Amino acid sequence: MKAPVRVAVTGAAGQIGYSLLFRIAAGEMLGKDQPVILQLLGSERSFQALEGVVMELEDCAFPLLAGLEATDDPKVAFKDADYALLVGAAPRKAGMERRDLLQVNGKIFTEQGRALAEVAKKDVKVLVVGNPANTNALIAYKNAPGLNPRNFTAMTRLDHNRAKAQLAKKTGTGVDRIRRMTVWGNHSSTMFPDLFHAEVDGRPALELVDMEWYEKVFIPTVAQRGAAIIQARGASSAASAANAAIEHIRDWALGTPEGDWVSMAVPSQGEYGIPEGIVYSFPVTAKDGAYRVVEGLEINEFARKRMEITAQELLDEMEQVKALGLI
Amino acid sequence: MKAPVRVAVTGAAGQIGYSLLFRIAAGEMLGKDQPVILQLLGSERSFQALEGVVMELEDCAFPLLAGLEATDDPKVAFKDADYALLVGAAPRKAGMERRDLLQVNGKIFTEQGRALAEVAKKDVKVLVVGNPANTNALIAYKNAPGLNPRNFTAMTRLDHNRAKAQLAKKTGTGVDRIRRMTVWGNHSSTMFPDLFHAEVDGRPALELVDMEWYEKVFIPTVAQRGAAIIQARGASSAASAANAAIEHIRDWALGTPEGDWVSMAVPSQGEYGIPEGIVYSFPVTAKDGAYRVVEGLEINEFARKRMEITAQELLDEMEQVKALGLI
């Protein structure tokens, strides 16, 4: 019954893409009732492999995959897009250095932000997964004037799900009984998983775990989880990253559960005193494709201190791209 | 919610497993109201990687994943298993030849079949994905007397789905409009994709395509699809294989569509004159864990000749295994 929506995905030939595309085509991201047209962007160096992923998708015989198109042109991939998941970012090359990587991503997201503004749906919902996510998102939306800045987001949902997982393990309770988890700030080592408002079966998390565990075990473990997966598998956390991206878009479009909220890095509008413009993760609720930061939460010194640390790191990153004239 | 079911998956740290486990945990295989307990089996050399996969699974915060346990002991993995997906098989490297690969596979499935008969549920539903799928299935159930051999199957659903995809592409119709596709025999190059009873939007397939295309384009393309993926991606078709495994179990456990059927390699009972005992793919309908071969279909010379060729190959493979005392 529902008309198909177009889902653009970049870095479609990479690991995250490989774990992402099939679940999207299966209807797990926008609903089992929502047909999807996948428009995949891949570099010329990976277009061959991309065609390979296209065949595998066809080989799943997905009833909801109403369209499938791979391209090397951003203006084609983003044409009339309703959703855009920017997974592709600067590659990891031995020579590729910090500031150099910043120049590559500056070009990628400047070009993609412009393409989105030119050819995608004006209300296109964008999610940046490619790292550095928050800053890449900033470059993108700043270079997409004409488009609602709040339609540009970065992913901290994996950090958020990782936090929920650790809490459920410690309390010995089902992860489905964990609510109001929050990861503030940047998707980096400065991320701040907040347990002051989290609940386990309706009971405050800090009534089940002590501050010592929270500060010395919980936070660092959530922060190092990504490294943990790489050391164990010798490969990145593609499947769980794809899952978080799916949930990030899903909750944004379909809505968050009553009484709960999720983490989303979005352009700050001064909420909780956080500097404006930077893409900062906030606790958010969503309804009908629009989200709203959860305001009014009590913030103690412990939380404030870490919220500013991560905020400052984002300002530093923003300063650098600004100094390079990228925004 | 339904009572939790135990799903065992071997070769869980491999590529198919990486594209399979998350979707099962998401409820895509047995339904959104069916909690699942994942019991994963991995080799001693891949156990570290499996531990990493376990973490990624936890990091998805799946509400339906009621249990998760990794082990390198088959008797642990198959303990009270309701479903068993045997994906791990012999790794074909350099040097190791035919008879050699047959020995390792022989030890694998003789041990796993014995473990299943000893610790799994008596009505455990088994699906063999690891190649040679059909013959490994034979070895398994042969080494699991007592357990109903009909509960042991091999996967041809990927060939099946690939065939539906090719017919859909050729006819310019939605793949969801493709019904009654059949893949007969062995999961190998002698596989026979049957278009004589298939319909495209309710119309006989051969009324839309001719024998020349069917024989010279359709059959070869379906048979070579696996290689097509490898040349394009430089890696095997893991995501589509995982999807095929999910659908094989799903349609078997829940049920096939009204007026439609699917392909499953099952121990032969003389249907259509196929030799008894060999695991042979047949067009089948299924409901609540029980399948039935669709008998009475008209078989012309073209179909019969190809059905016999693949059946003879299966007989040979069976002979070789019997010669090694594996069965």
Swiss-Prot record, chains A, B:
Gene3D superfamilies: Lactate dehydrogenase/glycoside hydrolase, family 4, C-terminal (3.90.110.10), NAD(P)-binding Rossmann-like Domain (3.40.50.720). The active site is at H187 (proton acceptor). It catalyses: (S)-malate + NAD(+) = oxaloacetate + NADH + H(+). InterPro entries: L-lactate/malate_DH, Lactate/malate_DH_C, Lactate/malate_DH_N, Lactate_DH/Glyco_Ohase_4_C, Malate_DH_AS, Malate_DH_type2, NAD(P)-bd_dom_sf. GO terms for molecular function: L-malate dehydrogenase (NAD+) activity. Keywords: NAD, Oxidoreductase, Tricarboxylic acid cycle. Its EC number is 1.1.1.37. GO terms for biological process: malate metabolic process; tricarboxylic acid cycle. Substrate binds at R92, R98, N131, R162. Belongs to the LDH/MDH superfamily. MDH type 2 family. This is Malate dehydrogenase. The gene is mdh.
